[PDB]
Write a protein that binds this ligand. Sequence first.
Ligand SMILES: COc1cc(Nc2nn([C@H]3COCC[C@@H]3C#N)cc2C(N)=O)ccc1Cl
Length: 294
Amino acid sequence: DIVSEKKPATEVDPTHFEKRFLKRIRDLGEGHFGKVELCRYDPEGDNTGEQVAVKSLKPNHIADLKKEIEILRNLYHENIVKYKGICTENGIKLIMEFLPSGSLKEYLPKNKNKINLKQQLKYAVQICKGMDYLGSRQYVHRDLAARNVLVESEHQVKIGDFGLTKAIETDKEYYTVKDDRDSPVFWYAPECLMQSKFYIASDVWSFGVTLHELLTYCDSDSSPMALFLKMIGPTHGQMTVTRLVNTLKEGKRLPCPPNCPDEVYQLMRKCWEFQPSNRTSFQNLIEGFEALLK
Ligand SMILES: COc1cc(Nc2nn([C@H]3COCC[C@@H]3C#N)cc2C(N)=O)ccc1Cl
């Protein structure tokens, strides 16, 4: 008789999502050769399955996606989006929990009435706690902006994208980047713009700019890009970044957001010391905000 293979152990992996049951609903966002879509994982095929956020490659940067997947899989913090699993074809898709409120960019313009200064400072503490957790794992985020901060509820935010996240080598203080063509220059510290060097303090600088967005309720007209382009001029093209570096070297910074008390603005200015070594830490920011909350 014919010889077949004995059926062995088949324990179902809860982190393995089958392609055939992962049904696309809509696009959520894009960023650095990746795209994020809302999908329903529907193995029963009746629209009752869980909604998930799915990151995949836009149709060679497969290595970058795999590295991002491995980082997120191992991060466990209240203010970091939850990894759910993967969908494997060499292809791979990252499956994450879906946060329907979106990012601070979508949420803040629509909920100004519900979100007061006290709530903004509580979101600022939560971003700092997620970032301090990331730093303790020796990672530099490199893309900290309000568009990457997801709203779990009126009371909770989570850092929701790790597309640019890099490990800082033990006993080294920074990561040197090579691919910088689509850098978020208006959120970047001078060392990132001048030498393409990324420190934990470079994320503190980016946090300061994110805090500025949070305080302005992510209004497009007072965005860090709109504000810096008004300061340096918007028709410089390829000369924009040197003009930005020059402006920062002169000591010019984003102005105090409307209705922001000076005490909060002073904590923000501490993120923006020209030299990385003079900048505040995430732990000291948490202390500062908590002092203002009680
Ligand atoms: C951008 O607008 C929306 C986004 C969401 N959700 C998400 N967005 N993202 C990323 C999408 O790409 C940009 C960066 C974002 C980050 N962080 C992840 C999620 C998610 N895990 O739920 C939900 C609703 C709306 Cl309207």
